[PDB]
């Protein structure tokens, strides 16, 4: 239902998406604080 629809490339894209979300949020935080 939530796991069987995901091929390997789907998992890798999801991981890259999570990493990009972390990158964007961290960049926003750094711009807020120290920029």
């Amino acid at each position: 239902a939530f796991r069987v629809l995901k091929p390997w490339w789907d998992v890798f894209t999801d991981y890259l998406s999570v990493a990009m979300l972390m990158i964007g949020v961290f960049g926003c935080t750094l711009q807020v604080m120290q920029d």
Partner: protein, 51 residues
Amino acid sequence: RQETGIDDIPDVKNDFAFMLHMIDQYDPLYSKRFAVFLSEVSENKLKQLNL
């Protein structure tokens, strides 16, 4: 059809083919276990056993 000798499960439409390809990429055996209930000869076997 070659293995179980059941000439049924002839083909599918576009949507069923799409879903079946995605299942095969996820796992090559779940499609084999899923197509049994589409088999006509298997359905005959189940009907005969139940009867």
